[PDB]
Design a protein around this ligand. Structure first.
Ligand SMILES: CCC[C@H](CC)C[C@H]1C[C@@H](CCS(=O)(=O)O[C@H](CC)CC[C@H](C)CC)C[C@@H](C)N1CC=O
Ligand code: NA
Length: 129
């Protein structure tokens, strides 16, 4: 599913991401924009043999099981395919664990390089939230 911007903002907020670990909703919407272009089905292979999955590009070396990643830990205890669903529940709940792991949102490279330090509230402007 390709979410609309405000549609994703509302779903993220309903699932408790607004201000989760101190990161405002616009941070999460910006992250999803540049990680996946709001597409739940996005997948991208990495050099270490892992793959990133879903709207927040969650990695199969640490967080989910895809059956083909050396050194897999599956800390979210889910198949990586669960992170591709139109229902973002599993991606949100796993993202909560990731962002709590110690490095905050720096775990998302696109957030670090394209959202951190910018006017992230722009990503929720116009939305009825
Ligand atoms: C907390 C878990 C951290 C993980 C890493 C431990 C996730 C990292 C993987 C990184 C892979 C970097 S890589 O250059 O070595 O491999 C590929 C290059 C061929 C990347 C290919 C891209 C993805 C195709 C578009 C890139 C980053 C996008 N995600 C997290 C989300 O931001
Ligand atoms: Na890699």
């Amino acid at each position: 599913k390709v979410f609309g911007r405000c549609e994703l903002a509302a779903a993220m907020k309903r699932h408790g991401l607004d201000n989760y670990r101190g990161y405002s909703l616009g941070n999460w919407v910006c992250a999803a924009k540049f990680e996946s272009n709001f597409n739940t089905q996005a997948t991208n292979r990495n050099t270490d043999g892992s793959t990133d999955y879903g709207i927040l590009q969650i990695n199969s070396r640490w967080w989910c099981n895809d059956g083909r990643t050396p050194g897999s830990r599956n800390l979210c205890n889910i198949p990586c395919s669960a992170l591709l669903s139109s229902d973002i529940t599993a991606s949100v709940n796993c993202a909560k664990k990731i962002v709590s792991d110690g490095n905050g949102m720096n775990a998302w490279v696109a957030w670090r390089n394209r959202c951190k330090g910018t006017d992230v509230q722009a990503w929720i402007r116009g939305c009825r939230l």
